[PDB]
Write a protein that binds this ligand. Structure first.
Ligand code: HEM
Length: 76
């Protein structure tokens, strides 16, 4: 379990072989391997490597779906 700053989390953007990580409510999830997040883009509107806590409100789903993915740390 690591502690990520947002600057560090931005590196995990799913591009050029980098893992795709997303933060939600202080926890960082590894969503690499989810075809929804490959390339670090999520259905046009969303970028990997960010805290998307607020962004979930507009999604056609809730944060429950993050549970299938490893928590790799907390966001500063
Ligand atoms: C932005 C408002 C937004 C859209 C649009 C969106 C769509 C979406 C779809 C259509 C799926 C597939 C449904 C399924 O259960 O398989 C999906 C799946 C996941 N999403 Fe999403 N999503 C939007 C936003 C967000 C945000 C802001 C996060 C995280 C903070 C997020 C996360 C996920 C996760 C995790 C899944 C499941 C992936 C998988 O099972 O492989 N989405 N989303």
């Amino acid at each position: 379990m690591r502690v990520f700053t947002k600057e560090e989390l931005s590196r995990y953007n799913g591009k050029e072989g980098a893992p795709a990580y997303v933060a939600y409510n202080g926890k960082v999830y590894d969503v690499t391997g989810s075809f929804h997040w490959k390339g670090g883009k999520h259905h046009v509107l969303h970028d990997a490597g960010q805290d998307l806590t607020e962004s979930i409100g507009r999604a056609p789903h809730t944060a429950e779906l993050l549970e299938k993915f490893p928590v790799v740390g907390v966001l500063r």
